Amino acid sequence: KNKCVNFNFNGLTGTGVLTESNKKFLPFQQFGRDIADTTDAVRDPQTL
Amino acid sequence: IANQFNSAIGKIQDSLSSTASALGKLQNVVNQNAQALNTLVKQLSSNF
């Protein structure tokens, strides 16, 4: 956490830092996006 | 003249606190710059 690293998820690849999010996700969706098709939140596939 | 001048200043505050379309010239500058930036980011998802 808190380091600009590389992301290798199941269906996503990016670069950035990882901090705590105050949002709420539904169990029928993995990640979230902004209004300009940019990713801002990802779910860990191991722990919820 | 001094009573007509003080009554004309007080009508500007009643016109600006009720009518929100009085500053439409300054609102069109901000809205035109937001559509030009949202179009540039949304064109990255195209395939060409």
Spatial neighbors of A4 by CB under 8 A, at least 6 apart, are: A15, A16, A17
Experimental method: cryo-EM
Identify all chain B residues contacting A37, using CB atoms and an 8 Å cutoff: 41-42, 44-45
Q: A37 and B42 in contact by Cβ < 8 A?
A: yes
Query: Which of these, B41, A34, A5, A33, lies nearest to A43 by C-alpha position?
Result: A33
B42 to chain A: closest CA residue: A36
Measured distance CA(B47)–CA(A7) in Å, rounded: 23
Query: Which of these, B45, B43, A16, lies nearest to A42 by C-alpha position?
Result: A16
Please name the residue that has the structure tokens 């500053």.
Answer: B23
Contact A43, A11 (CB under 8 A): no
Identify all chain B residues contacting A36, using CB atoms and an 8 Å cutoff: 38, 41-42
Mapped onto helix, strand or coil, the DSSP state of residue A26 is coil
Measured distance CA(A2)–CA(A5) in Å, rounded: 9
